[PDB]
Structure formats: structure tokens, C-alpha cells
């Protein structure tokens, strides 16, 4: 009477990014076979050995059929890099990134490392930042920048 | 029934200044036609070809009607500048901007760069800002300002 | 149909106090005429030219009738000043203002710049202010002040 | 059958010594008028503008008559004092008062200036306080005190 | 339906800790007598006289019966002490106590002064404590401790 | 409205491996009896004596019933350690661990002391960490790391 769902949680041992359709392939290949938590399976892909560990099966044992839901667990970080030669000083705020170069130029980026504001000021003396609001101070004038 | 908000965002490829009433002209002409994100439309103004790109439509597709909100995008952030020659020191607070000039005068603006208070004190020694309350301190007396 | 009220806001360019019945007299003279924001009117009072500017007409334009509400604005913020000669140190707290004078005397005021407590201590060494409580420390004695 | 008395409590904002019969004069002037809590009245005394505030009226609104009792209060805040000779250092916490004497003795009082804990430590080196928990550090012993 | 519960609030003038059964003894002695707020009663315990003041009776006058609830109002502190000789430095955290001894040993206790972890590191250079996580840093080894 | 719970923490004095259902057996024997912190119970198993000490009863005294949760204590805290030679500086955050080594290498671990990001920068000048966002500053470029 009570309906019980079937789900298998898998995790990859080597650090590699899988294609969008990887899940679809694993469904097609595994169906018909029975698996239990703790098993380790070796698959040859693109002439390279990749090991997959079964994290947990609900229920255990589990039989793989088209209806079974399969989920992959992964936790990689996104690394972004911008080449900057001759950095002078760096000011970091929880939700804003401000970098000053030796050339008396100020660049303002967001969390996504995208360029929003660019200005050069000969008489740049001080730069102040608070949350998402930024202000540039130069002997000639006051610049107020609002995001 | 339930009312759902519709919005269309347009941006011009060339950098040109549009009249304030531009929105009024556009909506009246375009109503009745359907547009989808990515479309390109050409409009002739005073014998000049300007290309407008449809940045986004919510929902997509979108039907252009007088009741829909149409907005023009020009810059990612808002930039305001004020010429101030001979700045001595600048104090920045989340909701207050205080600038002190060599002439021993104190100017207090808000985030919108509008003038709220103006005073000059020969014996100006210290200026302090805390929360929505601001105070100016001079050897002869104390000025307390409530906003 | 929702009803919209009628209100006119006026501001005087010169800083002068108007008689108590001034407002009522102006109302009588104006009613019957239509006014719009930005208009400037000149009135001769006791051989002195006082210029009044129309700050805002709600709605614009506005018709002046007996039923219309009239408000005169003097200042946008509240400025209070107190004479204090020979200030040595000043401590600001979210809801308290404490001033220490070279004469070894401590004055405690509230946000409204009113005097609550006055005490002088020959051997005054430290003044501690936190949130809403005040404590004065001198080598001879300890004073506990509860707001 | 029920007895109901009429009383008004007034407080003067400026700190000035009033003559013994001052209350008598005020009563004579005020009777016949009705007053409500919070009202502020300005009176000229000896060529000085004194502001009197109505602290409370029992009952409110109160009608001043010959039989109405008026009391003069002059306590804007609660002030307590303790005599202490040779204080070494004072540490103030949100809800605790800790005083260290030159004789390497530690006394802990509450907001009410009452004695809760008392100890002496020859090798007293440091005192640490955070929240409602306090600890005393001496070269020989670690003392932990829970409020 | 309206059942009225009776309560008597007592407070002692001298500060002393009472045994758990103290309340029971008082009740036995009092029943049968009538008491009103403000009365003073003297009880001899352990050869020392203690004076108890009746803080308030609800309702008054109250007749003491077995069914009356008696409550004692006091604000005493709990003192726990551990012998520790040769303390080097002490760091206090909101819910953790970390002590470093001259012998380069690190002790981690909780608020109750109970020992959770004991370790010793010859090359102890720094100790960091924040939130429910603590870490010990020595030039040879890095230790991560989850509490 | 109010939920009540009972828990007993027990610890064995001799080091012996107990079966998974050992807890169940103890429960059956003890129920019906009252226990208090500090009591010692002796159980005969296979002719060998094993003593169990009652570490703490919550609340105390406690009556053991089928609904009471019984827990066995073995590891009060989780300690994990890694060998690291030549540590230069260490910065700890509530949910992030950043370590900098003398060899100009930067290691970023999570709470579980697992490698998430590992890189080396000859010209490493400054390292700044805030919340789950990490930034590395080197003369060559700016590195932004998003968790």
C-alpha cells in the first residue's frame, strides 16, 4: 500500500567533470544488475580508468531499473583568474572587489570577477569601500558609484 | 483573475542620447506585434540608422501592449560626480558622506549626493558620524544634527 | 474611485519669521488662482521684499481653494547648538552624548541636547559609556548612573 | 464611596534652585486650566525662560483646582555612589561591574551596586569578562564564576 | 472554574544558601497562622540567627495552609575552582575555555570546567579559538579539533 | 506544550568491545530502579567482573524507564591530525581552514581537513580570507576562489 521510492547515490573517486549526459549512460548500462552500498566498480572511459564508489542505496539491496532515480554527488570549486601585472594594493569587501594598480587607476569588479567600473585618476589619494557602495577620493573631485 | 507583470528590456548598440519621451513613442508604435529575445529591429531617426537589440523578455515570447513596462538599459551602474577642489579629508559611512575642505567648512550629503547640511567652523577639530545621527565638534561649541 | 487630496508646499528664500496669522492671510489672497511648481511670487512686507518659491504642487497643477491644505517648510533637518568652551574629549554613544571638559567636569546629555546629569570630579581619570548605561571613575570614588 | 485623589507631578528641565514657596505660586497661576500628560509650558521667572514638563497626571485629563496637590520632582535619572580609595582599574560589562583595587583584590557587583562575589589573589595577573560569565586568572589558580 | 492559587514570597536579609529541605520545615511551622506583607519573622538555624522579611502575600491577608505555595527569591552565584600552577596565557571564548601552560601543554575545557581534550606539543607556536571549532598549530604538526 | 526527555550517560572503566545489542540488555536490567550520578554498578559477564560508572544523569535523580535514551561515551571530541613541516602562518574561519607554508604554497581545506584547492605561487605577497570566499594576491595576477 505504502509507496517506497528507489534512489542510488554515487560518487566519483578521481576528480573529473562528467558530461551532461553521463547519468543517462550509466542508467542504460546498469539496468538489470543488482548493487549494494560499499561496492566499487571500475569503468574504462576514453582509454582511462575511472573508479566509482556506491555511497548508499535506498533500499539496500537495490535493483536498477528505468524508474530508479540516480544522483551524482560532487563538490568542486570554481577558480577564476585575471592577469594583472604590477598590482599596487588590494581592498576586499564581503560583496565587492576593488583593485588599485601602480598606474593610479582603479578597477571595480563584482563577485563574478566581471568588470563594472573603470576610471583613471592622476591625483588618486584614497579609496574607500563599504558593502556594495564604493567611493573614490581625489584632490580634484568626489566620485560616487552606486551598484 | 490573477494579474501577472510583464517587462521588456531594450538596449541600443550605438552610444546615443534618447529623449525622455522616447518610451512614449516606442510603445505606441510597437503595440500589437510579438517579440522574442535576440531579435534585432532597425529604426530610422533623422536619416540615421540605429539598431536596437532585444536584451530580454519576461515572459518569452512577449506581446507588446500599452500595459507592459518598457525600460531602457544604458549602463550597469549609476555614476555621479561633483567637482570639489582642495579636499582635505573624507569620512565615509554606510548612509552618510561627510567631506571637509581646507577652508574649515563641513559639507554633509546622503547616498544620493544631495545637500542636507552646510556649516563652517573656524575651530573645526573633529567630525564624527554614527548611525543616522551626525555631530560636528569645534573648540567653542558642539553642533548636534538630527536627520 | 479613490480620492486624491490637494496640498501646496511653500518655502521662503530669506530666513525670516512670519506673524502667527500670516498663513491665513496668504490663503485668502491665493484662492481662485492656479499655481504650478517652480513659480516665484514677490510680496512686499513692511517695505521689505520677501520672495516665496513654490516647492511642490500636489497634483501639478494645483487649484487653491479653502479646502486645500497649506504647509510652510523652514528646514529639512533639526539643528540644535550648545555653547561649550574648552572641550578636551568627546564620546559618542548610540543613545547618549557625553562631553568631558578641561575643567575636570563631566556633562551628560540625551539625543535632544538636553541636560540630564552634571557632576565634577577632581581626580577624574576615565569615563566609560556603553549602550544606555554610564559610569564615571575617579581615584576617590565610583559613580553609577542608570538611565 | 471610593476615594479618588488628584495629583500632578511636574519636573523642571533647567537645574535651578526654586524658593520654598515656589510651588505655591505655580498652583495659584495654573488653577482653572486643564492639563494632559506630556504638555510643555514656558514661564518667565526672574528674566529667565524656564520650561516645565508635565510628567504625569492622575487622573488624566486633570483639572487644576484649589484642592489639587502638586509635587516637584528633580530626579531625571538614578544616581548611586560608593566610596573607593585607591582604585587600580575598572572593567565594565553590559550587566556586570568589576573593579580591581591596588591591593590585588577583585570585587564584583551587579547593576544594583550590590556585592555578589569577593576574593583576593596575591598573584592576580589578568581578569577576563564576557557575557554573564566571568573568570579570574592568577598564577596559582583558575577561578570560574557562573552568574 | 476560577480557582485561586495562593503564594507567599519570602526573602532573607543575610545572604546564605539554604538546604533543599529548608522550605518544607518553614511550611510546617507557619501553617495555622495568618501573615501580612511587611511582617518580620526570626528563625534560629545552626546557632546563627537569620531574619526573613515577608516580601508580599497574594492575596493579603493570607492564611497559611498545606495547599499554599512558598517561593524563595534569591540571586546567588556558583563558584568552581581548579588548582593550576604556572599559567602562561589564557584565552576565553563565548562557550569554550582554552588555557596554555608554561610547559607547552594545551588544555581544552568547557563552561563547566570539565576536561575534554589534553595534548602537549613541544613546538607550540599559536593557538586559535573561534566558534565551536578549535585548532592548535605547532611547527611540526597541525591538529584540527571538532567540539 | 512542553516536551520532556530523559538521558543517561554511562562509561565503562575496563576497555572491552561490547556487542551492538549490549545497550538493549542493560536497559532491560536497570528499568524500575532509580539512579544518581556517581553510582557504580557491577555486572557479571562470563565470570569476569566489569564495572560501569554513571557519568551523568539528566535530570538527577533519574528513574530508568523504557522511554529513556541510554548512550555510551567513548570519544568526547573528534581529533584529526596531519603532518606539516615548516608552517609559516595559519588563519582559521568558522567553516574554512587556510594554511600557508614557508615554501610559498597555499593549501585550502574544509572542516574535514580535506584538500579542496592546492596551488603554489613564487611571488605570493598577501593572503586574505573572509567567510566561504577566498582571495590570493600575487604580483602576477589576482585569484578569486568561489566555493
XYZ file of C-alpha atoms in Angstrom, chain B residues 8-16 18 22-23 52-56 70-77:
25
model
C 10.731 44.127 -21.803
C 14.346 45.323 -21.735
C 15.830 47.049 -24.776
C 19.360 48.360 -25.342
C 20.869 50.403 -28.256
C 24.085 49.262 -29.934
C 25.438 52.810 -30.685
C 26.005 55.299 -27.865
C 23.328 57.953 -28.366
C 17.496 59.447 -26.323
C 11.264 58.151 -26.127
C 9.367 55.454 -24.227
C 18.107 48.181 -31.144
C 18.619 44.713 -29.673
C 16.065 42.924 -27.504
C 18.069 42.035 -24.410
C 15.384 40.062 -22.594
C 9.303 49.000 -21.140
C 12.719 50.024 -19.810
C 15.915 51.205 -21.498
C 19.324 49.994 -20.320
C 22.425 52.154 -20.795
C 24.925 51.454 -18.006
C 25.384 48.643 -15.403
C 25.803 51.089 -12.511
